[PDB]
Amino acid sequence: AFCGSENHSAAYRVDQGVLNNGCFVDALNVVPHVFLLFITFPILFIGWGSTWLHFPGHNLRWILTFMLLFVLVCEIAEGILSDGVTESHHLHLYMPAGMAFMAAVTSVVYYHNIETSNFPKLLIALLVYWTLAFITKTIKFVKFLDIGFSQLRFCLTGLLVILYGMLLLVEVNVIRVRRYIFFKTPREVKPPEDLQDLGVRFLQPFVNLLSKGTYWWMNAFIKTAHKKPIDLRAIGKLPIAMRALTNYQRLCEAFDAQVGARAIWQALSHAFGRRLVLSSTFRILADLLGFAGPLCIFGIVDHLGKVYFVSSQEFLANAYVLAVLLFLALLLQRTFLQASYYVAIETGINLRGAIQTKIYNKIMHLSTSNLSMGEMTAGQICNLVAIDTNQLMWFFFLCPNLWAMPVQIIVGVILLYYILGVSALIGAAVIILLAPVQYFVATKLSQAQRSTLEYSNERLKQTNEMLRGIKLLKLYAWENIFRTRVETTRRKEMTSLRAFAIYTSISIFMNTAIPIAAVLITFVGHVSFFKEADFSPSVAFASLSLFHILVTPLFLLSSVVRSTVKALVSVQKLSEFLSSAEIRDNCCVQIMGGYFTWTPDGIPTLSNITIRIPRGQLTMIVGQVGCGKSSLLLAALGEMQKVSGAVFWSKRGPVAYASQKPWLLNATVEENIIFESPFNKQRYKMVIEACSLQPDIDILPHGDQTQIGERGINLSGGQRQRISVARALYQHANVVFLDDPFSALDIHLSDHLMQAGILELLRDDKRTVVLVTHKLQYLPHADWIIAMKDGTIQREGTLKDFQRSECQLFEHWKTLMNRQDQELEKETVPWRACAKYLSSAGILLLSLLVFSQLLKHMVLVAIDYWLAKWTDSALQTVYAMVFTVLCSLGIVLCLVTSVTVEWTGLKVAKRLHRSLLNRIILAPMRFFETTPLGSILNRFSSDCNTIDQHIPSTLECLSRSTLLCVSALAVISYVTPVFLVALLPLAIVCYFIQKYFRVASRDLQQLDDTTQLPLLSHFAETVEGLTTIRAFRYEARFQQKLLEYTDSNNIASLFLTAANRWLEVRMEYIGACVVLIAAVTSISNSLHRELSAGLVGLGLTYALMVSNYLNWMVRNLADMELQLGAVKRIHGLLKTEAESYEGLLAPSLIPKNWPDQGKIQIQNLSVRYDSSLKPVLKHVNALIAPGQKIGICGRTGSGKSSFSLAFFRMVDTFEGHIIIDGIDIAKLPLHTLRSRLSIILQDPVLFSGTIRFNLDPERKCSDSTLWEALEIAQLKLVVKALPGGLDAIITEGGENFSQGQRQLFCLARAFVRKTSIFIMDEATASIDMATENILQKVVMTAFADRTVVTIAHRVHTILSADLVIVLKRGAILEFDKPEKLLSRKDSVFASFVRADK
Ligand SMILES: Nc1ncnc2c1ncn2[C@@H]1O[C@H](COP(=O)(O)OP(=O)(O)OP(=O)(O)O)[C@@H](O)[C@H]1O
Ligand SMILES: Nc1ncnc2c1ncn2[C@@H]1O[C@H](COP(=O)(O)OP(=O)(O)O)[C@@H](O)[C@H]1O
Ligand SMILES: [Mg+2]
Ligand SMILES: [Mg+2]
């Protein structure tokens, strides 16, 4: 009944005034709301009962609408509470506020449906609705001036006046800007820069404020992952402010706006400063809203111990009112927290997208003398993209936590002083004792985290250069030596990881033990000294919850201080890399007087080279090894540092460079032959037909579209060089720089690539060809022969200019191809990985881990179940004598948990890298050939980085959070068992989100992985072929190709971020509902039944614990499920094969001098590479004398290298005997066989280190035998002219020297062994003819008694052999003396030596 039912004839009657009545204004302020409702719901019926742009004042109108909803929800509560004093139900108290609550939601729904459709004239209803109701609240505010500031409804209607007037001022802030009524200029603003037309599906900035906090736009994206899975071009593009190009520009303006390692920090606080400020303000607001939970736990438990308006003191002294106020505080704190998290993470993603483009822009100007001679490697650069940029991004996720922790500590100490008293100071300085100690171990971490990222980096050198040369380590039996070399660095890294793990264990122990020591010294330091300071369950379970909420930042301070040390050395390495070295009449190039140098401080490698290159004519650069050929090619491009002289051109213009070491993309065969050029089919066919690449293309599995490169099918040695040559013949570049292309090709391919190609594709089409070559038989075909000697050019000009003026190098050319009886002239033309993590820990450590974390939280509950038996006894010192022995059992059961977590996380990571390193070495070469090296290196680089450094923290956070959430649901179901009835229809709802989330999580997790991999692959392939890219002038195109990758990675990271925040805000809303339920069923159980009021505070404290640690349990469970995939991949690699190193023969029967007379008898041998392939050799029979010098010649693909590898059992021999010295070769251990036979591969496989290390990694032979085995490799004068002499530094891959001196260094490496069987698999390929003719005469005199099997590149060097093998497609075609083979004149050997004269 309205206006009461007591029948006093005073509220129904209006005599002295119809407006002066105490009632009837409650009857008057409803018809504005029913006016709005009954004219708004027709518009919802006729308009919406069947490229969006926000109106201005959007965030202010939504914030004022939420404040209006909160004040109306308080006014309904004031009406219901003020009715309870009366005898009956006075309807005029709760109905006029309830109708306004029903109409305000309708008003904000109406405003959103108007703004999303751009119907601004339809706001005229909202023009008037915020006037008259405001007017109807104004009279109700001024007729209440009879009751001021001591009655609650006075302040409530004053707030209603202020909110309605503010909404009216925002409403008139729409007509005056987007004019719809009473104006002549309808200033229609544009849609948001057409960001809905470009195909952006992110929609997070272009959403209303309710969908920005609850991520409601994401709720449609989870529902459509169940039907069709999420792919790229379904998450759309990026918005115009989150692109890497526009995030890179604001990084550059910050760098230019200030003209070191602090310049980046001032450049990151200027570009991305206000966004971190905004996220820190969201974190601060969530902190201040978190400091209203314990105030409600104070007020509720303080209530349980003890004119129709209700005073404002007796409103905040109610219990259900404080419960719903705590619920509405948690509901807004939990969304301010996610609003902080999203802004911080999107700022980190924009930072990553900016600094990756800055690193690439440094790469495109990077001098290659940094990579080659000295400082950095390619793996170091791809590490500072993959690891260092990710660490700097992960710092930006926690920088608002670092900025908003001390304000939480300060407000907690002030509120603790207000609640408990000066005894809070007893619990304050102890927390202040946590301030330098968490700094102190920080300094210790700044040692250890600066050491591990040193040592592991060196390990990622020594692993990688092992794997990329693993075949040579499996051919010299050096694999155990290199495995011990990596194990030493791994041991020195595990020492630093122990020193880091001990200090982060004591940091975790400090962060978890300083709160409980504070609780102990505060609660016993209260009842001992100040026994009259009002000890009560209210103040006890308020200050205990404040101590708990001062331990929620300490849940993350250890991870914050762990992550801010890895991001200072990150920006230190980034500043070290960004300020490194950089580059700056019918003739193409006309160098004159130019001294060029590789090292900036040293002798110039080229000296006074005054050359000229004719246009459209083939010019040849010939000379010895180390003579300046590739350096002269790289001085015209500008890669070498110019000291003096001039370099003219035609700016340069693009050339077609094909380097001495071929460089392949991670793309198909077609896509790195055309190389970002227009595809012309006829020119492509003429290119691959002149290169004779078509029969090698047909054997490939997909033909023209098979993914070759590093992360794909491993090609041969000549196929990749022919592809890299074929790239250069497809450019219209008009000047071709063909560095030595005949290294891996044989005679029949080289004579076809020289006739068609260099003489027919580039001499018909008048393109300048500059051909570095060692094949002097093509010296007739040149128009300008350049001849170098020790860097300086010796002579240039035609063959007439060389036979008339030089006449000594000319005769030296003529006696090199034995053409003395001729003339040189120009031609007139859970999972199992979790058990693997738990079985590699050991049962003694695992039972000490499980049964000491269930024992800590069974103690921590008894620490909080006591003080509920104590403070109920406060309404006597034996309660405090057993509280110290429980608080000391929460420290000594904390230290053991924090040490066994890190002990487990270290003992697993030691056991999981040694067991992987010992198994990768034992794997057969077929495993290294098929599977890409990028995967095997990523299991050593990233997964062995997340196992030791991320899982022992994630496991600790997961175990602590899930045990707090389990032990917190077991005591709010003990004090209120009715909560169990309310647990079942909600907790399974948690399951019914998580399953419903997971098919959109595990989908979107696989776009943050399969889009980061091409980004890292592009960063790896832009460094290996940097000189090739900068010579084609494809720097801008490759920068655009970077931007198109990092944008697609950034959008896939942003969608995963938004999905995570969607799930987390839903889980925290369920947690807030848990707090509301467990507060209501504790209050209503203590007011009716007798819950003794301490159990109510206990249940309230642990309900707040559920709200805090439900989301951390969910997040750490998802993070453990993500990080266990690394253990799964390592366990996948750990179950690989073995090469069967044991032999069928006991080592007592193999003599000490095993191949004492190399007497290799081969009978019916046939090899294969894998059991599904054709036999490479077939029925080969050969008998070799104990001192013969057999040579092997044949075409490419005949099986020459398979014959060479058949002695070392690197090919699957399935039929046939190889018997040496009467002892079979299959019944032999592999480390006995391979360490007593030598082989020189065609490719140089030099490792980084020193000359003495590369010649022998064991340091077993003397120093003088490293010189006799260097004098015969034609390198004594080169090594003796080095600064170090011996022990001079060879850098990674051997790039410090040439590709001729590299092959000479591998030849000298094989000559230090005193074995009696030698195999030379085309060793003299990169070496010139003069040095080869010297080297053969020194080798076949010093090794005058050793059996040498020489796979001959140029078959004119093999005529001095005793016997000659001619392979032709498998089986041996000819096997006789070379004179008897040449006497036939129709034999294949006489055919082979005919094409080389
Ligand atoms: N990338 C490099 N960084 C530093 N020094 C180099 C590099 N390349 C070569 N050198 C030095 O410069 C000298 C000239 O080598 P160059 O670059 O001319 O190779 P090259 O002689 O053309 O190769 P080849 O022996 O196949 O002809 C060598 O003695 C070597 O020590
Ligand atoms: N690692 C490998 N895996 C599979 N097949 C191979 C491998 N190496 C060589 N082959 C095959 O063996 C044949 C001859 O190989 P090889 O002896 O290396 O060539 P060449 O005699 O020209 O040096 C080739 O046709 C090639 O297809
Ligand atoms: Mg060279
Ligand atoms: Mg070969």
Short mmCIF file of N, CA, C and O in Angstrom, two decimals, residues 1163-1202:
data_model
loop_
_atom_site.label_atom_id
_atom_site.label_comp_id
_atom_site.label_asym_id
_atom_site.label_seq_id
_atom_site.Cartn_x
_atom_site.Cartn_y
_atom_site.Cartn_z
N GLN A 1163 83.51 -56.01 -52.57
CA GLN A 1163 82.87 -57.10 -53.29
C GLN A 1163 81.36 -56.94 -53.21
O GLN A 1163 80.79 -57.06 -52.12
N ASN A 1164 80.74 -56.65 -54.35
CA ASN A 1164 79.28 -56.62 -54.53
C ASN A 1164 78.60 -55.61 -53.62
O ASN A 1164 77.47 -55.83 -53.17
N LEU A 1165 79.26 -54.49 -53.36
CA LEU A 1165 78.71 -53.48 -52.47
C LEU A 1165 77.54 -52.77 -53.13
O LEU A 1165 77.52 -52.56 -54.35
N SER A 1166 76.53 -52.44 -52.33
CA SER A 1166 75.41 -51.62 -52.78
C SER A 1166 74.89 -50.84 -51.59
O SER A 1166 74.58 -51.43 -50.56
N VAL A 1167 74.82 -49.52 -51.72
CA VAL A 1167 74.44 -48.65 -50.63
C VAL A 1167 73.07 -48.06 -50.91
O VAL A 1167 72.55 -48.15 -52.02
N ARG A 1168 72.48 -47.46 -49.89
CA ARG A 1168 71.26 -46.69 -50.02
C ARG A 1168 71.21 -45.71 -48.86
O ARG A 1168 71.90 -45.90 -47.86
N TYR A 1169 70.41 -44.67 -49.00
CA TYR A 1169 70.33 -43.68 -47.93
C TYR A 1169 69.22 -43.96 -46.94
O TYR A 1169 69.36 -43.65 -45.75
N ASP A 1170 68.11 -44.54 -47.40
CA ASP A 1170 67.05 -45.00 -46.53
C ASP A 1170 66.36 -46.16 -47.22
O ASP A 1170 66.44 -46.31 -48.44
N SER A 1171 65.65 -46.97 -46.43
CA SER A 1171 65.17 -48.27 -46.88
C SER A 1171 64.06 -48.20 -47.93
O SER A 1171 63.66 -49.25 -48.43
N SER A 1172 63.57 -47.02 -48.29
CA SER A 1172 62.55 -46.88 -49.31
C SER A 1172 63.09 -46.30 -50.61
O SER A 1172 62.30 -45.92 -51.48
N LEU A 1173 64.40 -46.23 -50.76
CA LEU A 1173 65.02 -45.54 -51.89
C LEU A 1173 65.76 -46.52 -52.79
O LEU A 1173 65.98 -47.68 -52.45
N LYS A 1174 66.14 -46.01 -53.96
CA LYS A 1174 66.89 -46.80 -54.92
C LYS A 1174 68.33 -46.98 -54.43
O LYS A 1174 68.84 -46.16 -53.66
N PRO A 1175 69.01 -48.05 -54.85
CA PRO A 1175 70.43 -48.19 -54.51
C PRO A 1175 71.27 -47.17 -55.25
O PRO A 1175 71.21 -47.05 -56.47
N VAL A 1176 72.07 -46.42 -54.49
CA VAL A 1176 72.92 -45.39 -55.08
C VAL A 1176 74.09 -46.02 -55.80
O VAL A 1176 74.44 -45.63 -56.92
N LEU A 1177 74.74 -46.98 -55.16
CA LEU A 1177 75.71 -47.84 -55.83
C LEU A 1177 75.10 -49.22 -56.00
O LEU A 1177 74.19 -49.62 -55.28
N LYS A 1178 75.62 -49.96 -56.98
CA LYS A 1178 75.02 -51.25 -57.33
C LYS A 1178 76.11 -52.16 -57.86
O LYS A 1178 76.65 -51.90 -58.94
N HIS A 1179 76.43 -53.21 -57.10
CA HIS A 1179 77.32 -54.30 -57.51
C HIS A 1179 78.73 -53.81 -57.83
O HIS A 1179 79.38 -54.32 -58.74
N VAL A 1180 79.21 -52.82 -57.10
CA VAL A 1180 80.54 -52.28 -57.36
C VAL A 1180 81.58 -53.24 -56.81
O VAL A 1180 81.46 -53.74 -55.68
N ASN A 1181 82.59 -53.53 -57.61
CA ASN A 1181 83.68 -54.43 -57.24
C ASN A 1181 84.99 -53.71 -57.51
O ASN A 1181 85.22 -53.27 -58.64
N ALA A 1182 85.83 -53.60 -56.49
CA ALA A 1182 87.12 -52.94 -56.65
C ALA A 1182 88.09 -53.51 -55.63
O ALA A 1182 87.73 -53.70 -54.47
N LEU A 1183 89.31 -53.76 -56.07
CA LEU A 1183 90.38 -54.25 -55.21
C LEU A 1183 91.53 -53.25 -55.26
O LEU A 1183 92.02 -52.93 -56.34
N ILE A 1184 91.94 -52.76 -54.09
CA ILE A 1184 92.92 -51.69 -53.98
C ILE A 1184 94.16 -52.24 -53.31
O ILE A 1184 94.07 -52.88 -52.26
N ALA A 1185 95.32 -51.98 -53.92
CA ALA A 1185 96.60 -52.43 -53.38
C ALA A 1185 96.93 -51.67 -52.10
O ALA A 1185 96.35 -50.62 -51.83
N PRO A 1186 97.86 -52.20 -51.26
CA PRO A 1186 98.21 -51.50 -50.01
C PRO A 1186 98.86 -50.13 -50.13
O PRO A 1186 99.16 -49.52 -49.09
N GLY A 1187 99.11 -49.61 -51.33
CA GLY A 1187 99.69 -48.29 -51.44
C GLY A 1187 99.21 -47.48 -52.62
O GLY A 1187 99.79 -46.44 -52.93
N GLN A 1188 98.16 -47.95 -53.29
CA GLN A 1188 97.73 -47.35 -54.54
C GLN A 1188 97.05 -46.01 -54.31
O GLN A 1188 96.67 -45.66 -53.19
N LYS A 1189 96.87 -45.26 -55.39
CA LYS A 1189 96.39 -43.88 -55.36
C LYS A 1189 95.19 -43.72 -56.27
O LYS A 1189 95.18 -42.87 -57.16
N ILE A 1190 94.18 -44.59 -56.07
CA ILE A 1190 93.00 -44.65 -56.93
C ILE A 1190 92.29 -43.31 -57.01
O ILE A 1190 92.18 -42.57 -56.02
N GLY A 1191 91.82 -42.97 -58.20
CA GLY A 1191 91.05 -41.76 -58.41
C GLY A 1191 89.67 -42.11 -58.92
O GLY A 1191 89.48 -43.11 -59.60
N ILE A 1192 88.69 -41.28 -58.56
CA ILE A 1192 87.30 -41.54 -58.89
C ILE A 1192 86.76 -40.35 -59.66
O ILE A 1192 86.74 -39.23 -59.15
N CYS A 1193 86.30 -40.59 -60.88
CA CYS A 1193 85.72 -39.55 -61.71
C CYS A 1193 84.37 -40.02 -62.22
O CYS A 1193 84.09 -41.22 -62.26
N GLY A 1194 83.54 -39.07 -62.61
CA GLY A 1194 82.21 -39.38 -63.08
C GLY A 1194 81.35 -38.14 -63.04
O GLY A 1194 81.78 -37.07 -62.60
N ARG A 1195 80.12 -38.29 -63.51
CA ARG A 1195 79.22 -37.16 -63.56
C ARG A 1195 78.63 -36.89 -62.18
O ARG A 1195 78.81 -37.65 -61.23
N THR A 1196 77.90 -35.78 -62.08
CA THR A 1196 77.22 -35.44 -60.83
C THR A 1196 75.98 -36.31 -60.69
O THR A 1196 75.13 -36.33 -61.58
N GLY A 1197 75.89 -37.03 -59.58
CA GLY A 1197 74.84 -37.99 -59.37
C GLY A 1197 75.22 -39.42 -59.66
O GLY A 1197 74.37 -40.30 -59.57
N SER A 1198 76.49 -39.67 -60.00
CA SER A 1198 76.92 -41.04 -60.25
C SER A 1198 77.04 -41.84 -58.96
O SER A 1198 76.86 -43.06 -58.97
N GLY A 1199 77.34 -41.17 -57.86
CA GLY A 1199 77.49 -41.86 -56.59
C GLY A 1199 78.88 -41.74 -56.03
O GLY A 1199 79.35 -42.64 -55.32
N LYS A 1200 79.56 -40.64 -56.33
CA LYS A 1200 80.94 -40.47 -55.90
C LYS A 1200 81.03 -40.21 -54.40
O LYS A 1200 81.82 -40.84 -53.69
N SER A 1201 80.21 -39.29 -53.89
CA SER A 1201 80.19 -39.05 -52.46
C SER A 1201 79.58 -40.21 -51.69
O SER A 1201 79.94 -40.42 -50.53
N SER A 1202 78.70 -40.99 -52.31
CA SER A 1202 78.19 -42.19 -51.66
C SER A 1202 79.26 -43.26 -51.57
O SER A 1202 79.32 -44.00 -50.58
#
